Write a protein that binds this ligand. Structure first.
Ligand SMILES: Nc1nc2c(ncn2[C@@H]2O[C@H](COP(=O)(O)OP(=O)(O)O)[C@@H](O)[C@H]2O)c(=O)[nH]1
Lengths: 440, 20
């Protein structure tokens, strides 16, 4: 089962850089792309193929495709990792969109160059045999990045019906100049609504809070947000990168979490034990399962008032004791609440620690993370909706950026924005209907 | 954002000096 990763935008490129750094340091690859084991004759206890390609000279090539419009930022990853990434997998533009532009120019450029991108992804697909699905990594605030991501997602979903699509979206924190970024994000969401099968979102406020809580002298920690995102994705993909008893595919993971394709919005959580002062707050799996329910550990700043849980799936890595998890689940079934029209959905995915990094092994040291389906996910949507619910009327500085597929045709732009807001309200209504227990 | 990036680089300098 091969997974094909795609990254969009400068933020997506940084996230991919940190992610591949963590993966290489966990699989003992290094900056060159050679084996770090003293003897190559011995067998391994994992499978690197689902994420890396293998050649005759023992060279590991990451099957990642990065998109960009200004090659200045995308060259740093190759300048730090010499010969690791394939230079033919990258794509760069020439005299495209403006700095900080809307999604419109990026979408136009994507529809212009979607042929060569499709040919490249096809020539990268034909390199393997057992192909499972795609992964996308980007943000909704950036214009060109979100446009290219939306175009590629539409192409993938309407060309490949039997392949899974999982997306990672980065959302900006509540600020002043984000009035236009969220304005453009409103329509960028449209593609994630109908095309994405599984998706996770990240907010910058909670990331900065976790950074200020963990790292010293916290001033600006965008790199630490990248580290947290990479750690979350690596802990998610750990259960497939290292074989286990039950879970060996992304579909088996997502089947126990994603209901009918209108509630596939998930919120992640992670133990303060990072993966980059780390020896503290790592007592036991008991305390991990306890503080996994802490709202301060959530990756999105939400409110604590009898939260409604649809599905919960937690993964714990390390040497775990059964009695701790037994008692933890025994009391969490009483503490956590869920709607009465469904059944309790809580799952554990005890995994394996990487037997290739010189870790500090303890008898009870473990780490943990948890994904959940929440109804409070609509709050981050309302935080952007209330902004443009009152400014779109005049549109003085909104129409200047030419937010639309056509130029100066405000009628079609208004039609697109109206239908986007209507489908957003439809998602909100579908969520509140399941929350209100109307079917009961 | 340039000043923010420079101050992140200052964070990295302080960390590497602590390691030194
Ligand atoms: N995930 C992530 N996102 C970031 C980070 N730093 C900034 N961002 C956001 O990601 C967006 C990326 O915009 P981008 O597509 O690069 O704009 P462009 O340079 O004009 O193409 C910005 O609007 C930022 O708000 C980071 O460290 N991680």
């Amino acid at each position: 089962g091969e997974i094909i990763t795609l990254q969009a935008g400068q933020c997506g490129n940084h996230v991919g850089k940190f992610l591949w750094s963590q993966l290489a340091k966990e699989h003992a690859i290094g900056t060159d792309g050679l084996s770090q084991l003293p003897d190559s004759s011995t067998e391994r206890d994992d499978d690197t193929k689902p994420f890396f390609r293998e050649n005759s000279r023992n060279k590991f090539t990451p099957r990642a495709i990065m998109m960009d419009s200004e090659p200045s930022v995308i060259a740093d990853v190759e300048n730090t990792f010499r010969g690791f990434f394939d230079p033919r997998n990258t794509w760069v533009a020439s005299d495209g969109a403006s700095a900080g532009n809307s999604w419109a120019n990026g979408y136009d450029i994507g529809t212009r160059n979607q042929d060569d991108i499709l040919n490249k992804i096809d020539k990268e697909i034909d390199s393997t045999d057992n192909f499972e699905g795609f992964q996308l990594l980007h943000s909704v605030a950036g214009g060109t990045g979100s446009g290219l991501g939306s175009n590629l997602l539409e192409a993938l979903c309407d060309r490949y019906p039997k392949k899974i699509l999982t997306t990672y979206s980065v959302f900006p924190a509540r600020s002043s100049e984000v009035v236009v970024q969220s304005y453009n994000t409103i329509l960028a969401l449209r593609r994630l609504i109908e095309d994405s099968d599984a998706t996770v979102v990240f907010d910058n406020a909670s990331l900065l809070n976790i950074s200020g809580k963990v790292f010293r002298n916290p001033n600006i920690d965008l790199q630490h947000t990248n580290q947290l995102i990479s750690t979350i994705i690596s802990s998610v993909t750990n259960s497939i990168r290292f074989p286990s008893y039950m879970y060996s595919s992304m579909s088996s993971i997502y089947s126990t979490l994603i209901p009918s394709p209108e509630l596939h919005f998930l919120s992640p959580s992670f133990t303060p034990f990072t993966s980059d002062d780390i020896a503290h707050k790592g007592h036991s799996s008991y305390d991990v399962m306890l503080d996994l329910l802490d709202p301060s550990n959530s990756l999105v700043s939400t409110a604590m008032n009898n939260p409604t849980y649809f599905n919960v799936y937690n993964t714990i890595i390390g040497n775990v004791e059964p009695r701790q998890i037994s008692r933890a689940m025994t009391k969490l079934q009483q503490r956590i609440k869920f709607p009465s029209w469904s059944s309790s959905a809580m799952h554990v995915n005890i995994g394996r620690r990487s037997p290739y990094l010189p870790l500090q092994p303890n008898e009870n040291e473990v780490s943990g993370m948890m994904l959940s389906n929440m109804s409070t996910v609509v709050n981050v949507f309302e935080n952007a909706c209330n902004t443009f619910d009152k400014v779109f009327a005049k549109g003085a500085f909104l129409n200047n950026y030419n937010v639309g597929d056509l130029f100066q045709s405000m009628q079609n732009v208004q039609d697109e924005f109206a239908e986007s807001r209507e489908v957003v309200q439809s998602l909100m209504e579908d969520y509140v209907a399941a929350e209100q227990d109307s079917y009961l | 954002e340039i000043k923010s990036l420079k101050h992140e680089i200052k964070e990295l300098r302080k960390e590497k000096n602590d390691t030194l």
